[PDB]
Nucleic acid binder design. Sequence first.
RNA 1: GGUA
Length: 312
Amino acid sequence: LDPRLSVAPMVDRTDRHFRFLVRQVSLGVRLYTEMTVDQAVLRGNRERLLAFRPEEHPIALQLAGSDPKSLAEAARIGEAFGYDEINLNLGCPSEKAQEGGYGACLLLDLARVREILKAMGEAVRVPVTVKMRLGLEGKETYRGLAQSVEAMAEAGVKVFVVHARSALLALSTKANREIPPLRHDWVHRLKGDFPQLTFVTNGGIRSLEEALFHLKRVDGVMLGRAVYEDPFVLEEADRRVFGLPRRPSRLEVARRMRAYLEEEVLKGTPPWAVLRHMLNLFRGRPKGRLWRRLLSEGRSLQALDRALRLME
RNA sequence: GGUA
Ligand SMILES: Cc1cc2nc3c(=O)[nH]c(=O)nc-3n(C[C@H](O)[C@H](O)[C@H](O)COP(=O)(O)O)c2cc1C
């Protein structure tokens, strides 16, 4: 498991279509699914929810839930689908998370978190990891954070992805990634205190240069919004992070997405399910706005063909 | 089944 660089799990963003796009930009970057509730995996259509392309490796499935047995079985199923890692969501502050007692509100019950992780760890052979916040209600302490890390490590967890801020359950989800202050220094300190463990820091990191800064202090960096707002924020990732002699081209990626789009349309996928994630491919580039316009207006393969000729 |  290479922890150096990852794209954050993002509901309504990091579905298989956007993940495929990102993979065209960076071969090395680690991909995460949208948060997927365990009940959905158990009772829903597992193909629709879990199926992914082999090119997406390395890829982790993120699960949400509160019941050890349900999550363990969901992890087992996730493993069967070929995911390289089962990630436990411990950071979602949504109203639905609060009603279902999952996500960030699990940090109130370390005993429960430990039995969840133990059950998950015994159900699969792939790494079981966590994505967490610094605490709840802005009442977090460094000792409290370290204690939670210890509890989870006792349960077998080695990889800790930390959104380096508290969660304020009274605020909206959007506000919960803007208002609570970031404390990346705490994640830096965790690595200093738990050298044997793997720490990936997350929150407000806008560029590869900024990621490189943190990579001097922690094992990895996870980027969310910056990547969706402009996938080519990862343009130099393969070369500067992963030491690969590879540099993507926006036009090459766009051409690959066209062939991808044709395959998907073939099997019933709505064109917009793919195109809606391609709007920022030319962010801040010449004709980038017309590109967005053409795709958003046409929402079809024919529209993509017009945009491609525009950018050729 | 699901964090503007
Ligand atoms: C639209 C959106 C959806 C998100 N969905 C998830 C999710 O499903 N699971 C999760 O652990 N975090 C989710 N998050 C939080 C991100 O993973 C990440 O921790 C947060 O955006 C801060 O990182 P960033 O500043 O690089 O974007 C989501 C964030 C956004 C903006």
